[PDB]
Amino acid sequence: GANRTLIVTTILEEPYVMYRKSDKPLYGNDRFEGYCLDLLKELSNILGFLYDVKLVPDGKYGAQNDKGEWNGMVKELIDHRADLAVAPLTITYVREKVIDFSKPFMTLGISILYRKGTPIDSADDLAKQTKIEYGAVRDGSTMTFFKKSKISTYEKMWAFMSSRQQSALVKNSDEGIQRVLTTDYALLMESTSIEYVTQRNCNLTQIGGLIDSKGYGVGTPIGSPYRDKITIAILQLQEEGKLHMMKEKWW
Ligand X SMILES: N[C@@H](CCC(=O)O)C(=O)O
Q: Which residues are annotated as a binding site for L-glutamate?
A: 88, 90, 95
SS3 content of the chain, % helix, strand, coil (to 5): 40, 20, 40
Q: Does 208 sit near a copy of itself (CB under 8 A)?
A: yes
> Which residues, 115 to 134, sit near a copy of itself by CB under 8 A?
121-125
Among 89, 204, 211, 230, binds ligand X (CB under 6 A): 89
User: Which partner from the list ligand X, a copy of itself, none does 136 bind, CB cut-off 5 to 8 Å by kind?
Assistant: ligand X
Binding string, residues 213-242; x marks residues near a copy of itself by CB under 8 A:
x-x-------------------x--xxxxx
Torsion, CA 16, CA 18, CA 21, CA 22, rounded to 10: 100
Q: Shortest distance, CB of residue 60 to ligand X, whole angstroms?
A: 8
CB 9 within 8 A of CB 60: no
DSSP 84-134: EE-SS-B--TTGGGTEEEPSPSEEE-EEEEEESSSS--SHHHHHH-SSSEE
- Short-list 125, 134, 162, 132, CA closest to 147: 162
Q: Does 136 sit near ligand X (CB under 6 A)?
A: yes
d(CA 29, CA 37): 8
Among 190, 220, 226, 230, binds ligand X (CB under 6 A): 190
User: Which partner from the list a copy of itself, ligand X, none does 141 bind, CB cut-off 5 to 8 Å by kind?
Assistant: ligand X
Partners of residue 135 on adjacent β-strands: 187
Q: Shortest distance, CB of residue 13 to ligand X, whole angstroms?
A: 8
- Label residue 29 exposed, middle or buried (CB < 10 Å: 0-12, 13-18, 19+): middle
Phi, psi of 40 (to 5 degrees): -60, -45
Q: Is the dihedral of CA 113, 119, 123, 126 positive or negative?
A: negative
Closer to ligand X by Cβ: residue 60 or 243:
60
Q: Does 210 sit near a copy of itself (CB under 8 A)?
A: yes
Residue nearest to ligand X (CB): 140
Q: Does 147 sit near a copy of itself (CB under 8 A)?
A: no
Which positions lie near a copy of itself, rule CB under 8 A?
Answer: 104, 107, 109, 121-125, 151, 153-154, 207-211, 213, 215, 235, 238-245, 247
Which positions lie near ligand X, rule CB under 6 A?
Answer: 61, 88-90, 136-137, 140-143, 189-190
